[PDB]
Write a protein that binds this ligand. Structure first.
Ligand SMILES: [Zn+2]
Lengths: 125, 53, 56, 155, 195, 323, 38
């Protein structure tokens, strides 16, 4: 409540390499602040490119909102979206990245597409 | 022609589309359907030092 | 307190049976022909409609 | 498509009885009740699905004495389904003609255990189907750039 | 005892194998903070170390997901646990820690006029984290191999922790061979900087 | 009470009449050797070939009078055929604008929808719906697959046990449920105990294995000679061995020479032993007796008979260029 | 022997993208969007 300009500073690089439960995931590569509306735009743009018969888009919104207006302060490596399978459909990297490519522009900071399991942050970074 | 930000953002959209060099600037020309033409954005073909950095 | 690694009593320095999966997307070098394929010109593949239709 | 589809559907004719011992109708129910549920997929995603058009008689459905309505010529009599062992490799197919997920065949080959000798060939043809999928786009990407999944899907 | 004086931290035996800097693997006695000890113990992942629990314990394998892995703590288990802990202690000391670094910068873009190398990354480790490692285990990023580190701000580097498959280290760390060593280089004037 | 042919696995072809008239009507006009400018396919009913929209349009598209093909097709197809059987007609048009059409039995979709007693749009892919369409035994699949050969000249090829899977898998793909397969058990037999069924199975399957084996043996004997030559296995090669073997030619051809049947020409110990030791210089497969090299490396899709023939020094000792 | 797994190999010239080949051009595609820090 009534937090100062220096609070929840995203600028540090985190030690937590996230674990993405979904088959694919979209992960924050830099520091920044993201508006909710931007993530909604991203979500809709991604849902345009998904085969809704085999797939479900999971958005991680549970992070704190910080006053500016309320937005998110994102550290490197924080997961955003998850492509979760309802069936045996196994995407390639080109396909998954082609899917997240729609929603990348709306997000103001750089993002990486990461495959199922734990982020291998030697390869990502 | 539309100017792409860099060489990576440059794709061949059609069957007849080609990579060509405009004086050290890499570009894409289609003899059919000219709306497919892409330039890499870079310095003018003629530039001096004070005039262009 | 100072912190230091234990010695090696048994087994290899880099985990062999315990390998983490490597995090790249596993595209075979020969399955996607891009680079790192050093193939002798005698052994050149996939010419089936060009020169490997008239073999040997 | 409405092309190459039968515009009529003749019936089955049961020529000879496969058995001489007639079943009680409770046997005809207890076998049928066994049939209505089946398994789909063979892997971690594996789901029981209820089967539509489960026949009244299980004992007499496909296994002998029934004449199929697949006849074509004028003098073609409806083919009578013969005994099982006179049909070649049927017991061998029952083992191997099933959905085989790639991962799973592979692990069998590594452990050097195959349910049938043929599952080698089942594997080799799967790989070739996958790599063909790779080989096609690489003839298509050559002629023109084709970008995977950037277009809006549906309407 | 008292509501005022509360134990800074209390000893705990572990049942699960827990990921974080506080959590341990199954079977080892570690003393961790109150608020973490209660949230581990009430969730059944940790027990109070009574003596017969120091001799043997019912832990679990994640496959069966029931506490059926019985480990009895004998001598050859306790040296194993000692080594395992003093491995992942170095693991959770270094990435959790963020090594503050400061130096002098002249010129226009944000470069250090005395670039870093592997002998003084390993130095800062000992200076503020008291971590002693052979400096030849460190490897830089691809961009920083050629010039050294040399740029202001947030940089990361990689530390290779060699031996663990002996300790069965998997899934309780982020990866078995590596730690992201996080450097931050701040420019300071001639008063406060070195070199 | 009657059971027609009780014999171990000779129900393979259909009966005589169907075979021979399917020979003289479904048939191959020989390829003249011209440049094909159109390969056309149609589904046309038996008694009726029409000058209506599809065939008339595509023949008038070339300027060809479509009445002739229609008349010839009706003269050839109206007799011998039961009604409402839609046939595959493949017309091949050459650069002389002269054509040759083949008449082929109906598509597999047609047979499956006949045999399942199902009309059109009554069946689909399973995840699209979430329930199987009609049950089918593998007995029925054979009498579907019997009808489609590769070449009516030779009905035996390709072999049923293989090509049946095409039918099974296409039916699969249609959403058909199955018995032999995709359910644990086989449709109940009234008169026999389960152990009797299974004991029957374990002898019958190996009888069929033997028959299939000899069948593809004389299959391979009809073939040209180069398939009876040596293509060694690459899988037993340690993958770095394969790629470094692709980096230089000598590893692979010395390998080929080393693992080869002992035939008069290639059986030479002098050129073999130094070949083996030349391979073993570089860490190639070293735990090998040469005679187990001849086992580990051999053509694997080559059938059992001629491969034991090649393994055997005696049977292959006889093939020698005379003069 | 630390240097067996530790890689110091300084890559002098950065490897470029094959515009002289049509298939390798699109197969080497990098799906990436340039973003300046805000
Ligand atoms: Zn174009």
């Amino acid at each position: 409540i009534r937090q100062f300009r220096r609070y929840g500073d995203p600028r540090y690089i985190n030690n937590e390499a996230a674990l993405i439960r979904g088959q694919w995931g979209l992960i924050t590569a830099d520091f920044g602040m993201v508006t909710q509306s931007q993530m909604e735009n991203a979500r809709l743009a991604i849902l345009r490119r998904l085969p809704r018969g085999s797939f479900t888009l999971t958005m991680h919104t549970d992070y704190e909102e910080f006053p500016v207006h309320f937005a998110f302060k994102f550290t490197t490596g924080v997961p955003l979206f998850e492509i979760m399978p309802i069936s045996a459909r196994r995407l390639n990297q080109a396909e998954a990245e082609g899917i997240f490519l729609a929603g990348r522009p709306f997000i103001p900071l750089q993002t990486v597409v990461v495959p199922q399991g734990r982020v291998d942050e030697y390869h990502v970074f | 022609p539309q100017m792409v930000m860099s060489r990576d953002e440059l794709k061949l959209r059609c069957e007849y589309c080609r990579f060509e060099w405009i004086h050290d600037t890499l570009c894409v020309r289609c003899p059919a359907q000219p709306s497919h033409d892409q330039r890499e954005m870079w310095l003018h073909s003629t530039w001096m030092w004070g005039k262009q950095q | 307190r100072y912190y230091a690694l234990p010695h090696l009593r048994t087994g290899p320095p880099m985990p062999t049976t315990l390998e983490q999966p490597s995090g790249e997307f596993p595209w075979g070098k020969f399955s996607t022909m891009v680079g790192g394929t050093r193939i002798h010109p005698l052994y050149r593949p996939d010419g089936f409609f060009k020169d490997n239709m008239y073999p040997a | 498509k409405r092309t190459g589809k039968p515009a009529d559907t003749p019936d089955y004719k049961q020529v000879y009885l496969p058995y001489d011992a007639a079943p009680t109708e409770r046997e005809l129910e207890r076998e049928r009740r066994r049939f209505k549920q089946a398994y789909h997929g063979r892997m971690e995603h594996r789901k029981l699905v209820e089967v539509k058009e489960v026949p009244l008689n299980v004992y007499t459905y496909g296994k002998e004495g029934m004449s199929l309505p697949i006849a074509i010529f004028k003098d073609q009599k409806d083919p009578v389904i013969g005994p099982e062992w006179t049909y070649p490799g049927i017991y061998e197919n029952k083992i191997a003609a099933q959905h085989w997920y790639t991962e799973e065949l592979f692990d069998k080959e590594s452990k050097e255990a195959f349910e049938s000798p043929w599952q080698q060939q089942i594997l080799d043809n799967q790989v070739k189907r996958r790599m063909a999928k790779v080989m096609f786009r690489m003839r298509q990407v050559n002629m023109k750039a084709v970008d995977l999944f950037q277009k809006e899907r549906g309407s | 005892m008292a509501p005022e004086l509360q134990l800074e931290y209390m000893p705990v035996l572990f049942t699960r194998t827990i990921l974080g800097p506080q959590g341990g693997f199954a079977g080892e006695e570690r003393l961790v903070k109150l608020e973490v000890a209660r949230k581990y113990m009430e969730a059944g992942h940790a027990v109070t170390p009574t003596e017969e629990l120091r001799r043997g314990l019912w832990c679990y394998n994640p496959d069966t997901d029931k506490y059926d892995c019985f480990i009895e703590r004998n001598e050859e288990f306790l040296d194993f646990a000692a080594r395992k802990r003093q491995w992942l202690d170095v693991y959770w000391r270094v990435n959790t820690g963020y090594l503050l670094f400061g130096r002098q910068s002249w010129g226009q873009g944000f470069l250090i006029n005395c670039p870093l190398r592997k002998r003084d990354v390993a130095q800062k480790l000992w200076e503020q984290y008291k971590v002693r490692i052979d400096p030849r285990l460190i490897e830089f990023r691809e961009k920083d191999r050629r010039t050294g580190i040399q740029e202001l701000g947030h940089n990361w580097c990689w530390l290779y922790l060699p031996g663990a498959e002996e300790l069965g280290i998997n899934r309780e760390v982020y990866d078995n061979k590596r730690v992201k060593v996080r450097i931050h280089v701040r420019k300071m004037n001639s008063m406060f900087a070195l070199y | 009470p009657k059971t027609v042919c009780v014999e171990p696995g000779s129900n393979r072809l259909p009966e005589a009449l169907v075979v021979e008239k399917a020979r003289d009507i479904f048939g191959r006009p020989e390829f003249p050797g011209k440049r094909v400018l159109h390969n056309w396919r149609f589904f046309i009913k038996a008694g009726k070939a029409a000058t209506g929209p599809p065939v008339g349009q595509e023949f008038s598209k070339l300027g060809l009078k479509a009445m002739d093909f229609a008349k010839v097709f009706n003269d050839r197809t109206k007799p011998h055929f039961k009604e409402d059987v839609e046939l595959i007609v493949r017309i091949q048009v050459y650069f002389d604008k002269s054509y040759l059409f083949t008449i082929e039995p109906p598509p597999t979709a047609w047979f499956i929808l006949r045999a399942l007693r199902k009309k059109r749009r009554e069946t689909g892919p399973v995840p699209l719906r979430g329930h199987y369409c009609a049950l089918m035994t593998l007995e029925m699949a054979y009498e579907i697959a019997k009808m489609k050969p590769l070449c009516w000249g030779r009905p035996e090829y390709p072999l049923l046990e293989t090509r049946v899977r095409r039918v099974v898998g296409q039916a699969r793909r249609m959403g058909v449920c199955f018995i032999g397969v995709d359910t644990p058990y086989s449709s109940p037999v009234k008169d026999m105990t389960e152990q009797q069924y299974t004991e029957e199975c374990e002898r019958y399957r190996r009888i069929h294995m033997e028959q299939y084996t000899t069948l593809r043996q004389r299959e391979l004997e009809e073939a040209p000679l180069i398939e009876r030559l040596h293509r060694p296995n690459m899988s037993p090669l340690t993958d770095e061995q394969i790629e470094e073997g692709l980096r230089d030619p000598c590893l692979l051809d010395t390998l080929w020479r080393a693992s080869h049947p002992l035939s008069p020409y290639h059986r030479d110990l002098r050129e073999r032993e130094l070949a083996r030791r030349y391979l073993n210089a570089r860490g190639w497969v070293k735990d090998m007796t040469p005679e187990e090299m001849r086992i580990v490396f051999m053509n694997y899709r080559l059938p059992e008979g001629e491969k034991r023939k090649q393994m055997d020094e005696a049977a292959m000792s006889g093939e020698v260029y005379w003069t | 022997d630390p240097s067996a797994f530790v890689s110091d190999t300084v890559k002098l010239r950065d490897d470029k993208r094959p515009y002289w080949s049509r298939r390798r051009w699109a197969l080497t595609d990098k799906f990436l969007v340039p973003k300046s820090p805000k």
